[PDB]
């Protein structure tokens, strides 16, 4: 015979082991594979799709109101519209996104992001915004003039409805020994007033989108904290 000896770790059930087991039904041929559209082979393919941010950063805004920021005559010169903290983890505009939800299955994330803002006023609505990027460590701007001194976009939405901005490399993690917190900001100020004709609505709205880029990466898969734990549970036993 073969002289053998058992190792430490023999007869254990590790939940992450990679061993073939006994087929319960061999000679059973399964249903053959058919081409179904939209096959996912990598979860980063999901994370690179744009999804709406909750750029309305006000509480008492619920549901559909959170996805849009209104500009009107109530928005003044040099006035703060929204502030997007670049936190995948924490409660903010990036939490309920495809890049926020899929990244909470992982511990360490890393990469560039892709914001897109779409102006959704009327055809003849005109005006200018300053979309800022504040890097990690730096302070978020509170004035339009401090906003223009940073990395910014002077966006005339009078004719260009969509603007996009590369977010260079946020990359936070998870700590127990504690959060990442401040890793960056996207901030918007009113450069001008909103100029609408007298038959268009006074109020015009912005919506934001976030996607990950091809350099985005995720590591150390964990359990997502989002949904925790109901009806007809013990029906699968009786």
């Amino acid at each position: 015979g073969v002289p053998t000896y058992l190792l430490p770790g023999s007869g254990q059930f590790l939940t992450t082991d990679d061993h073939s087991s006994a087929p319960a039904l061999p000679c059973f041929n399964p249903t053959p594979e058919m081409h179904i559209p939209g096959q996912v082979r990598n979860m980063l393919e999901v994370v690179q799709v744009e999804s709406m941010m909750e750029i309305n950063n006000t509480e008492s805004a619920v549901g559909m109101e959170r996805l849009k920021v209104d500009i009107s005559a109530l928005t003044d010169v040099d006035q703060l519209l929204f502030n997007i903290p670049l936190d995948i983890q924490l409660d903010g505009p990036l939490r309920n996104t495809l890049v926020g939800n899929i990244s909470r299955y992982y511990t360490h994330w890393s990469g560039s992001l892709e914001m897109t803002f779409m102006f959704c006023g009327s055809f003849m609505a005109a005006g200018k915004l300053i979309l800022c990027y504040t890097p990690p460590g730096g302070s978020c701007p509170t004035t339009r003039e401090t906003a223009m001194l940073g990395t910014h976009i002077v966006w005339d939405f009078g004719l260009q409805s969509s603007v996009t901005l590369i977010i260079p490399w946020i990359s936070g993690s998870h700590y127990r020994m504690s959060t990442n917190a401040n890793v960056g900001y996207v901030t918007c100020f009113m450069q001008t007033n909103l100029i609408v004709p007298s038959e268009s609505s006074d109020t015009c709205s912005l919506i934001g989108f976030i996607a990950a880029k091809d350099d985005f990466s995720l590591r150390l898969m964990r359990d997502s904290p989002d949904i925790g734990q109901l009806h007809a549970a013990e029906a699968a036993y009786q």
Partner: protein
């Protein structure tokens, strides 16, 4: 709270592979049953919706094709411990599920039975891809039938089968409690048409109702 940061050095896409994203042995069922010779044996309809975190991971997709690696981890506790033989029998769709401990369906020549002891390593089998279609419908925008509440969301080609577990031993003067933990690891996974994650808590197992 205290706030920190680290330079993160990552490269590679291999851990977000859907095979790596989903193939782990997750606890999919856990029951106690007492024994003194579906009461007094373990019967579980093999689904993926018992626990909400595996449910929310698999409901990130519309269609899934996988083999299930079932691991059964039985512990005993008296009301030492005797060494007992257990029968775990996979009852597919189209076979008949036992209703008693000593029923004749446990004598199944065609169901996959595995006989195993407590002192052994945990029993492990691979249930194949059992569906009539090419993938399991994680969601089903249809009805199982049309005659007076053939229920919505139920697909007749999604039923894996039942996992029936009993004690092959006869009655003993000691009484004891058998806890059957069932661990499933999906294998050879293909996924299609990814979906938004669920943001609201689940209300039922059989549907997608939301409380808000």
């Amino acid at each position: 709270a205290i706030q920190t940061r680290t330079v993160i050095n990552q490269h590679g896409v291999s851990e977000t592979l859907v095979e790596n994203f989903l193939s782990r042995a997750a606890l999919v069922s856990k029951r106690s049953f007492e024994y003194k010779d579906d009461k007094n044996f373990f019967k579980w309809t093999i689904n993926t919706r018992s626990f909400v975190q595996l449910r929310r991971k698999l409901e990130l997709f519309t269609y899934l094709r996988f083999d299930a690696e079932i691991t059964i981890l039985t512990t005993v506790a008296v009301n030492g411990l005797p060494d007992l033989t257990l029968q775990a029998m996979f009852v597919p769709t189209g076979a008949l599920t036992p209703e008693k401990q000593d029923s004749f369906h446990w004598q199944s020549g065609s169901n996959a039975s595995v006989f195993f002891k407590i002192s052994d390593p945990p029993a492990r089998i691979t249930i194949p891809f059992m569906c009539i279609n090419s993938a399991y419908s994680v969601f089903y925008d249809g009805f199982a039938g049309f005659e007076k509440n053939g229920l919505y969301g139920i697909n007749p080609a999604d039923t894996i089968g039942n996992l029936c577990v009993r004690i092959v031993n006869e009655h003993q003067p000691v009484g004891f409690t058998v806890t059957v933990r069932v661990y499933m690891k999906p294998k050879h996974i293909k996924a299609w048409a990814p979906r938004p994650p669920r943001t609201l808590p689940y209300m039922s197992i059989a549907n997608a109702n939301y409380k808000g």
